[PDB]
């Protein structure tokens, strides 16, 4: 029983931002939570594109790449969605993927902006984030140019591809006054103070703490739009707990095997 | 003078020898004239070698390229066998020669 | 072989959903040249369905 | 009980020729009981030492009052009562040199012991009568405590 | 051409084992846990939580190659305590700490949303 | 050729901001004021709109083969 | 040229100069992490150079664990003063510039290209000539 007893203080919560503070935990725990923010939080993003027609100036793999990076609202759906690899379906089904379609032809003499508003899903929950600011521009079409495609968006996390990363910016820091001397400033007076610095203006560093350890960690998790910023953190804690649970199950099997 | 002081064995100074060597080695270094004769022959051989070195290296450059690093392996022998340099040694000079 | 040259879809395993063309096929495994990447994978034919 | 040296030192100088390292400072200290000269590299960050400070310095072959020699291995779970409990700054090192004013004529009257605590060097020099416990390539412990 | 698939960093293939324990004979009460398809994310927390245990004499982790996906955790404990028990206790404490953190995060989020 | 959907460094959406950036620059905004008005605060995102060359406008001058 | 063809280079050289400075202290977790990458480690953590107030190991202890066998070597750092060898502090270096490896242990001194490089009489050269090619290969890999 050597577990930490960490506390949470939410200092800011908007639709694209959670600034919170985790106290009384370890630096490894804080960094693993920060890494799971980027790499191990599953969202829904386009991963299968067939293109029936592409008369645009951008080639087909270009359009597929731009479709994969469009975020889709994965709230309360990616939890009840299976992985395609773990699904028993032959090709695709609502249990593991969301179907998107696009059919835009430009018949007018001005440029047609094929945006993420033109992405039509059969699931009313999983839609492009800008369709729920302008829309994410996929391609521009001249007159006589057409883009007709069918896509499937599956579930995955940022460890596989960056299009499944739910976060824009995970600001993470600790010990804002350099009390632990984890970084050593050659000229401490040359360095600007952070947002969380508790020093007056004449000071440049805290006095050195010989017995101190990293015990308070400041996060600013910014969401790209797929999940709410608090949903990213909750799913990250759940995913890290699930990874440790599966590792403990395999460890119990390995121990009882010997 | 420096070569004579550094490289010639001094079997005459007995009280300086009692701390350099153990007592039973000092007894047959002082008494046995054969040991003293062979040590003097060793010093004469080294003086002849010194003159040969003077002929070979006339610019006085002592940096040579030789197979076995003798000083390093003497240091290795000191460290392996825990040689205390503050104590008299149990190695007789005739054993060295 | 009757599978070589036929377009094919991986239906099981970690390549599920990928479309390819069978360059070389045996009774057990088939070399599927993938349309989506720059590689030719080797996958067993029980994970393959013909489009 | 394994003690090789025991004295009270007072600091005459801190980094005389300038500070060469940020966290390590070189103290020059003198003594009262045996008239000793001490040069000691101290981790000045975790153990700050001011000029003119007085401290008890103990150099021991082991950290136990039993006198039993240790293995030089880290043992945080050791529960026997250590000698380090009575001191603030405890280092572990290997004495690497014994120098002296000995000649082929006269024995050593002054002795200098050079110890390396993981690269933090110490020279303890003085009368030879108090430096008999130092033998080259033996592991010693330095234990200093500040005196109010 | 020689690009590894993106799932190879986290998916065990057929016949691959998630965790393997090998007792190294260099020192007593030491074990090496080879965990496949894992990275620094689990290695760091397991190493730190083992370092919080006073009965653990050594706790370390390493990735032998960043191009491979394999974690080696070397755990040496006191003779009255096994490295496998230390590993199980570390994972149990990590899971309990993360569950407490998740519940307190939900409580604080509800406090921030309500007012 | 066309504005990236994601910022390369962090992954913020910058693909819905190019036309708004051009409209703000047409409204006699300075480029820094335009980037501040679009919520691009990190300098990794600001270089995505600042350094972008819209070559797709030049590609759309040529008539389509179809 | 009866000298090694390969020595420690670039990042490993810069960080072994930064590592073997006198004021480099590693905490317990950092020491265990560094010992995870020492393939010739016998499995016992050495006694730290400082036990109290906090148990801290120096980088010289870790490199002494890296140094194979019982290598004996004397080098000088590239910033070693010329007048120091004739001064009173020749065997206790104020600037930690005389490198002494004794019984395979880095007693004192900051390592650099003059000690870990391709020059004759260096630590890797003496490691080769005393231990053999296999032990020296392990030495190179462990340093890196
Ligand atoms: Zn399915
Ligand atoms: Zn950015």
Swiss-Prot record, chain B:
Subcellular localization: Nucleus; Cytoplasm; Chromosome
PTM entry text: The tandem heptapeptide repeats in the C-terminal domain (CTD) can be highly phosphorylated. The phosphorylation activates Pol II. Phosphorylation occurs mainly at residues 'Ser-2' and 'Ser-5' of the heptapeptide repeat and is mediated, at least, by CDK7 and CDK9. POLR2A associated with DNA is specifically phosphorylated at 'Ser-5' of the CTD by CDK7, promoting transcription initiation by triggering dissociation from DNA. Phosphorylated at 'Ser-2', Ser-5' and 'Ser-7' of the CTD by CDK9 (P-TEFb complex), promoting transcription elongation.
Quaternary organization: Component of the RNA polymerase II (Pol II) core complex consisting of 12 subunits: a ten-subunit catalytic core composed of POLR2A/RPB1, POLR2B/RPB2, POLR2C/RPB3, POLR2I/RPB9, POLR2J/RPB11, POLR2E/RPABC1, POLR2F/RPABC2, POLR2H/RPABC3, POLR2K/RPABC4 and POLR2L/RPABC5 and a mobile stalk composed of two subunits POLR2D/RPB4 and POLR2G/RPB7, protruding from the core and functioning primarily in transcription initiation. Part of Pol II(G) complex, in which Pol II core associates with an additional subunit POLR2M; unlike conventional Pol II, Pol II(G) functions as a transcriptional repressor.
Family: Belongs to the RNA polymerase beta' chain family.
Domain notes: The C-terminal domain (CTD) serves as a platform for assembly of factors that regulate transcription initiation, elongation, termination and mRNA processing.
Function: Catalytic core component of RNA polymerase II (Pol II), a DNA-dependent RNA polymerase which synthesizes mRNA precursors and many functional non-coding RNAs using the four ribonucleoside triphosphates as substrates. Pol II-mediated transcription cycle proceeds through transcription initiation, transcription elongation and transcription termination stages. RNA-dependent RNA polymerase that catalyzes the extension of a non-coding RNA (ncRNA) at the 3'-end using the four ribonucleoside triphosphates as substrates. An internal ncRNA sequence near the 3'-end serves as a template in a single-round Pol II-mediated RNA polymerization reaction. May decrease the stability of ncRNAs that repress Pol II-mediated gene transcription.
Name used for this protein in its record: DNA-directed RNA polymerase II subunit RPB1
Part of the full-length chain shown: 914 to 1010 of 1970
Swiss-Prot record, chain C:
Modifications the protein undergoes after translation, according to the UniProt entry: Methylated by PRMT1/HRMT1L2 and PRMT5/SKB1. Methylation negatively regulates interaction with P-TEFb and RNA polymerase II. Phosphorylated by CDK7 and CDK9. Phosphorylation by P-TEFb (CDK9) at Thr residues of the C-terminal repeats alleviates transcriptional pausing and promotes transcription elongation. Dephosphorylated by the INTAC complex when transcripts are unfavorably configured for transcriptional elongation, leading to premature transcription termination: dephosphorylation is mediated by the PPP2CA component of the INTAC complex. Dephosphorylated by the PNUTS-PP1 complex in termination zones downstream of poly(A) sites, thereby promoting deceleration of RNA polymerase II transcription.
Residue span(s) of domain KOW: 2-35
Subcellular compartments: Nucleus
Residues recorded with modification N6-acetyllysine: 16
Highest rank taxon of the organism: Eukaryota
Tissue expression per record: Ubiquitously expressed.
Subunit structure: Interacts with SUPT4H1 to form DSIF. DSIF interacts with the positive transcription elongation factor b complex (P-TEFb complex), which is composed of CDK9 and cyclin-T (CCNT1 or CCNT2). DSIF interacts with RNA polymerase II (Pol II); forms DNA and RNA clamps that stabilize Pol II elongation complex while maintaining the nontemplate DNA strand in the transcription bubble and nascent RNA in the exit channel. This interaction is reduced by phosphorylation of the C-terminal domain (CTD) of POLR2A by P-TEFb.
Function summary: Component of the DRB sensitivity-inducing factor complex (DSIF complex), which regulates mRNA processing and transcription elongation by RNA polymerase II. DSIF positively regulates mRNA capping by stimulating the mRNA guanylyltransferase activity of RNGTT/CAP1A. DSIF also acts cooperatively with the negative elongation factor complex (NELF complex) to enhance transcriptional pausing at sites proximal to the promoter. Transcriptional pausing may facilitate the assembly of an elongation competent RNA polymerase II complex.
Family assignment from sequence similarity: Belongs to the SPT5 family.
Name assigned to this protein: Transcription elongation factor SPT5
Part of the whole protein covered: 703 to 753 of 1087
């Amino acid at each position: 029983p050597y577990a930490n007893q960490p506390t949470v203080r939410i200092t800011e919560l908007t639709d694209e931002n959670v600034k919170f503070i985790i106290e009384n935990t370890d630096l490894a725990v804080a960094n693993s939570i920060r890494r799971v923010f980027i790499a191990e939080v599953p969202i829904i993003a386009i991963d299968w594109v067939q293109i029936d027609a592409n008369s645009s100036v951008l080639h087909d793999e270009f359009i597929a790449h731009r479709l994969g990076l469009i975020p889709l609202t994965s709230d309360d759906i990616v939890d009840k969605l299976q992985y395609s690899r773990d699904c028993t379906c032959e090709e695709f089904c609502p249990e593991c993927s969301v179907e998107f379609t696009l059919d835009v032809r430009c018949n007018e003499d001005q440029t047609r902006h094929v945006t993420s508003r033109d992405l039509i899903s059969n699931s009313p929950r999983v839609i492009p984030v800008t369709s729920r600011q302008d829309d994410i521009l996929i391609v521009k079409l001249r007159k006589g140019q057409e883009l007709r495609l069918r896509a499937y968006a599956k579930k995955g996390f940022g460890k596989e591809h960056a299009k499944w990363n739910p976060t824009a910016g995970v600001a993470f820091e600790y010990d804002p006054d350099n009390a632990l001397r984890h970084t050593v400033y050659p000229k401490p007076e040359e360095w600007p103070k952070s947002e969380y610095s508790e020093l007056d203006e004449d000071e440049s560093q805290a006095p050195y703490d010989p017995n101190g350890k990293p015990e308070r960690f400041y996060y600013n998790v910014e969401s790209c739009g797929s999940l709410r910023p608090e949903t990213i953190v909750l799913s990250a804690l759940s995913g890290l707990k699930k990874k440790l649970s599966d590792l403990q199950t395999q460890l119990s099997h390995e121990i009882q095997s010997d | 003078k420096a070569f004579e002081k550094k490289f010639r064995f001094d079997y005459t100074n007995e009280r300086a020898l009692r701390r350099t060597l153990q007592e039973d080695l000092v007894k047959d270094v002082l008494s046995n004239a054969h040991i003293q004769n062979e040590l003097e022959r060793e010093f004469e051989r080294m003086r002849e070698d010194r003159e040969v070195l003077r002929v070979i290296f006339p610019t006085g450059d002592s940096k040579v390229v030789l197979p076995c690093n003798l000083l390093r392996m003497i240091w290795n022998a000191q460290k392996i066998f825990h040689i205390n340099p503050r104590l008299p040694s149990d190695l007789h000079p005739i054993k060295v020669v | 072989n009757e599978l070589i040259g036929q377009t094919v879809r991986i239906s099981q395993g970690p390549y599920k959903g990928y479309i390819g063309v069978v360059k070389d096929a045996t009774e057990s495994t088939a070399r599927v040249e993938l349309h989506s990447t720059c590689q030719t994978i080797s996958v067993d034919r029980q994970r393959l369905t013909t489009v | 009980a394994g003690i090789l040296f025991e004295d009270i030192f007072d600091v005459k100088d801190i980094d005389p020729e300038g500070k060469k390292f940020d966290r390590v400072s070189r103290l020059h200290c003198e003594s009262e009981s045996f008239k000793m000269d001490l040069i000691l590299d101290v981790n000045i960050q975790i153990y700050p030492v001011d000029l003119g400070d007085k401290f008890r310095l103990v150099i021991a072959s082991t950290l136990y009052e039993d006198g039993t020699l240790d293995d030089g291995e880290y043992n945080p779970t050791d529960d026997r009562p250590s000698r380090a409990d009575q001191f603030e700054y405890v280092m572990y090192g290997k004495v690497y040199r014994i120098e002296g004013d000995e000649t082929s004529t006269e024995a050593a009257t002054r002795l200098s012991a050079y110890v390396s605590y993981g690269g933090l060097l110490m020279r303890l020099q003085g009368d030879a009568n108090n430096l008999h416990g130092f033998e080259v390539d033996s592991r010693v412990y330095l234990l200093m405590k500040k005196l109010a | 051409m020689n690009a590894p698939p993106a799932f190879e960093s986290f998916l065990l293939f057929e016949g691959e084992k998630k965790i393997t324990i090998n007792k190294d004979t260099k020192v007593p009460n030491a074990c090496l846990f080879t965990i496949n398809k894992e990275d620094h994310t689990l290695g760091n927390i397991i190493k730190s939580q083992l370092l919080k245990d006073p009965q653990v004499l050594f706790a370390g982790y390493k990735v032998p190659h960043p191009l491979e996906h394999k974690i080696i955790i070397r755990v040496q404990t006191t003779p009255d305590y096994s490295p496998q028990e230390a590993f199980t206790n570390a994972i149990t404490d990590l899971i309990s700490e993360l569950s407490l953190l998740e519940e307190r995060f939900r409580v604080a989020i509800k406090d921030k949303q309500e007012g | 050729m066309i504005i990236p959907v994601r910022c390369f460094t962090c992954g913020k959406i910058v693909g819905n901001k190019w036309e708004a950036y051009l409209g703000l620059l047409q409204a006699e905004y300075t480029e820094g004021d335009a980037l501040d008005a679009l919520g691009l605060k990190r300098y990794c995102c600001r270089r995505m709109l600042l350094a972008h060359v819209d070559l797709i406008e030049k590609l759309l001058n040529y008539a389509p083969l179809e | 040229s009866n000298r090694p063809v390969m020595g420690i280079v670039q990042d490993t050289l810069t960080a072994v100069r930064k590592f073997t400075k006198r004021d480099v202290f590693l905490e317990r977790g950092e020491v265990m992490n560094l010992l995870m990458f020492l393939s010739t480690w016998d499995g016992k953590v050495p006694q730290p150079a400082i036990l109290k107030p906090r148990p801290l190991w120096t980088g010289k202890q870790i490199f002494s664990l890296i140094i194979p066998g019982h290598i004996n070597c004397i080098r000088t750092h590239s910033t070693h003063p010329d007048d120091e060898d004739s001064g009173p502090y020749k065997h206790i270096s104020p600037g930690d510039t005389k490198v002494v490896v004794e019984n395979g242990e880095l007693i004192m001194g900051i390592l650099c290209k003059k000690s870990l490089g391709t020059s004759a009489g260096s630590l890797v050269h003496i490691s080769y000539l005393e231990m053999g090619h296999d032990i020296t290969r392990l030495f190179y890999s462990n340093i890196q």
